[PDB]
Titin,Titin,Titin (Homo sapiens), 195 residues
Amino acid sequence: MTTQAPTFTQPLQSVVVLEGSTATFEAHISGFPVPEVSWFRDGQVISTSTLPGVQISFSDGRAKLTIPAVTKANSGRYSLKATNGSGQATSTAELLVKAETAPPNFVQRLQSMTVRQGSQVRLQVRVTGIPTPVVKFYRDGAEIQSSLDFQISQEGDLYSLLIAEAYPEDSGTYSVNATNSVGRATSTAELLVQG
């Protein structure tokens, strides 16, 4: 129960949290008298006003800072100052907020099919990915340009290559390629038109 400068028995930890999830900075501080605790983020003092919804507690030498819904703006370098009459102790980490992403995933893949001549062929895929993938069609390896009766259309995550009337020359290997900043996915199918 004698005077002792503040010290960090448990310092802060640099954390990578996904946006939308909760984040928590905690630290165990010892020093008599019980030090005063202040939180900081990039030079600005942290309170309920600076960062809304934040929760700060100090119980039994355990200081904790909790952000319920972390956003991209909540990132930066966080510091923790402990102060009494005998000295000052400061621990610092930083919060890294990565936006939620997802590699391209073919919910519905291309299906190889054999049809008669003059029939209507519909090649269809449902692609998911964050950020929204760049979906490109390919015929025998070459990129397909949206022709008139060889049309490529999109509705949300659904992509369709509609052939009005299929002919034997339309036979080949059709493939769709979806790429974004986190991955690449491909689907491939063979089409055969008989006459």
